[PDB]
């Protein structure tokens, strides 16, 4: 189709490897672009582990309250929020929030933790239907991003489809499911990403992550205006460790969905 080459010249252009996964629930249509190919999620995978700790707190009323103590040594490379509480405390929906809308890594080891460690993700992914999903590691060795290695990586359609039922299908409870859209609509970090592509009148929730061989990715549940919703996943990794980051190659592949609409 004429999105598909264009996604691939997109792709050639780029100089790396792009994966693209479009569902448009108006009518259930879909866009692949190496669907079925594997990407290290990096920290999109800490929407996977705020929806699980989401659906703990459906059978612990109190567990989003809950106090977690952030000590020195938790920080790892990136505590934009949690660097503020060490040697203090941070609630698990708090630790959910700086994780989400902030990308913080020393909350996404909260949550980690918070489900069993890694294999705990992997479970409650394995639990709403995902096969494809996996989480290995805590942060911040999880965004090795290492070419053929499985850890931390997913595919496309299988996070698009995923991504689709924590936020508009019932793998959560509604009150979970409206928290999780509401997290993902106050992401700060997703401005130069998918939202870049879409026109300015359209809603996005998102979770970028990025991490090495220039790894640049995004998932975001898009709500344009008059139009059911969209779920558009893209990942994008590159051939050498040290690549710096292209949030405009994912724009630029979500303007072309946004075009095939
Ligand atoms: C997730 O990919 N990470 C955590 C944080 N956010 O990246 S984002 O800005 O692309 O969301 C820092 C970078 C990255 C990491 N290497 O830990």
């Keep these: 189709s004429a999105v598909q080459q264009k996604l691939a010249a997109l792709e050639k252009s780029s100089g790396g490897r792009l994966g693209v996964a479009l569902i448009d629930t108006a009518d259930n249509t879909q866009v692949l672009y190496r669907g079925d190919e594997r990407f290290p999620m990096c920290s999109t995978s800490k929407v996977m582990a705020a929806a699980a700790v989401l659906k703990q707190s459906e059978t612990q009323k109190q567990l989003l309250n809950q106090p977690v103590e ?16 060490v040697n203090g405390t941070m609630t698990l929906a708090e630790l959910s929030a700086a994780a989400l809308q902030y990308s913080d890594n020393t909350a996404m080891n909260k949550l980690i933790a918070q489900l069993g460690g890694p294999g705990g993700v992997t479970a409650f992914a394995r639990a709403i239907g995902d096969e494809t999903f996996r989480l290995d590691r805590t942060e911040p060795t999880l965004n090795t991003a290492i070419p053929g290695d499985p850890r931390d990586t997913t595919t496309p359609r299988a996070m698009a489809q995923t991504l689709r039922q924590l936020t508009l299908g019932h793998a959560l409870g509604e009150t979970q499911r409206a928290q999780l859209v509401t997290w993902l609509k106050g992401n700060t970090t997703g401005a130069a990403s998918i939202r870049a592509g879409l026109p300015t009148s359209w809603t996005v929730g998102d979770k970028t992550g990025s991490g090495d ?20 996943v893209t990942y994008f990794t590159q051939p050498q460790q040290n690549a710096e980051s292209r949030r405009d190659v994912l724009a630029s592949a979500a303007r072309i969905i946004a075009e095939g609409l």
């Design 70 to 85: 952030i000590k020195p040594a938790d920080l790892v490379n990136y505590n934009p929020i949690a660097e503020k509480h």
């Design 213 to 232: 061989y220039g790894t640049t990715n995004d998932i975001a549940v898009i709500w344009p205006q008059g139009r059911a919703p969209l779920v558009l």
